[PDB]
Structures are given as C-alpha cells and as structure tokens.
C-alpha cells in the first residue's frame, strides 16, 4: 500500500525529489516497483549508499525497499540504419533475408536447439521466482512470532 506522495516525502530526506511515482500497471494494482528521480547526482549517490548500507523503511510493515541505480531504457531514437557500423560481419549476417525456417533443415534443427535453450532459461527464471515467492511467504507468516519474541527479550532486559 503505497502512494506517490509517500515516495516523494520519504525520499525527501536525502534531497529534493522532482518525481516519485509508483510503477502501476493497467488494472491499478502496484507492480512492486517504483521510479524516483532526484535533482543532483551527489544527492542520488548519497541516498543510494545510505539505503544500501542502511535499512530505509516506508511504513509499519517492517520491510525495507531495495535501492539500485536506474537503467535508462530508450525507445525514441531506436536504432537508425546509418548509426550501425556496417562493417564486414554485417554483410556476413545479411547474406539472406528474414524468413521462416524450412522443416528438416539445419536452420530448423539449430532453431530447435535455441528454442529449447530459451525455454530452459524461462523455466529457470520461473523456478527462481517461485523460490523467492515461497521464501517471502514463509518470512511473512512469522510477523507475530518474531515481534513477540523481540518484545519479550527487550522488556526482560
């Protein structure tokens, strides 16, 4: 449960926040991610290192947010033809135009190998996602136990 102003104010400690909008998909539920942009590079670096070495927490739910530098994916320029190197290997990779792979040929077999490798990659990524999800679910089920134990130990101290 997050809001744009929540990220705007929470990260306002490290510096001025020009924009802080939670990445939200079409339906409206949060996607579990967000984008925050500062004004100065030193402020962003300080926030990044403080969050990495520290535990920046947002709400009552004691789950801090992981902070990493933003990679910038651009889709405006794309890639024009003239900015390609157009060197020798480009001609090597442009001997024949794009087309379907003829069944029973070498191209079809090697494409089968590539598709199998890609499917195995997807299966491994899904397995990692499942492991992370189960670990998080197990970690969430013990909210009350750990909190009560810490209360016990602190107050007995």
């Amino acid at each position: 449960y997050v809001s744009n102003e929540l990220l705007e104010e929470a990260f306002s400690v490290f510096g001025q926040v020009e924009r802080a909008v939670v990445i939200v998909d079409d339906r409206g539920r949060p996607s579990g991610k967000g984008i925050v942009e500062f004004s100065g590079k030193p402020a962003a670096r300080k926030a990044l290192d403080r969050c990495s070495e520290g535990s920046f927490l947002l709400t009552t739910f004691p789950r801090p947010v992981t902070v990493e530098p933003m990679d910038q994916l651009d889709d405006e320029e794309g890639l024009p033809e003239k900015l390609v190197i157009k060197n020798q290997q480009f001609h090597k990779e442009r001997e024949q135009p794009p087309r379907f792979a003829q069944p029973g040929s070498f191209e079809y077999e090697y494409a089968m190998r590539w598709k199998a490798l890609i499917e195995m990659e997807k299966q491994q990524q899904d397995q990692v996602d499942r492991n992370i999800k189960e670990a998080r679910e197990k970690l969430e089920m013990e909210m009350e136990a750990a909190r009560h134990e810490h209360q016990v130990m602190l107050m007995r101290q």
Binding site: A145, H148, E149, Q151, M155, R156
Partner: protein, 50 residues
C-alpha cells in the same frame, strides 16, 4: 504531658529519612511487580503463539 510530647516530637523527627526510604522502596516494588505481571502474561501469550 509536655515532656512526654517533647519526646514524641523528637522521636517523630528521627524517622524523616527512614519512612521516606520505605515509601520509595514500596512504590518501586509495586512497579516491579506490575511489570513482572506484564512479563508473565505476554511471555505465555508468545509461547502459545510459538
């Protein structure tokens, strides 16, 4: 009567510090017992949850 009382006042003056110490000790003990009661209650609740 005057002498007996002169003595009663003198005696009651002597317990200035002792009664104060007793009162402070007693209030500290009451606070300690109520905190220990909280301790046992929340500890057994935590044990049941575990």
């Amino acid at each position: 009567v005057e002498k007996n009382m002169k003595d009663a006042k003198d005696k009651l003056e002597s317990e200035m510090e002792d009664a104060y110490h007793e009162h402070q000790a007693n209030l500290l003990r009451q606070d300690l017992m109520r905190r220990q009661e909280e301790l046992r209650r929340m500890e057994e609740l935590h044990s049941q949850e575990m």
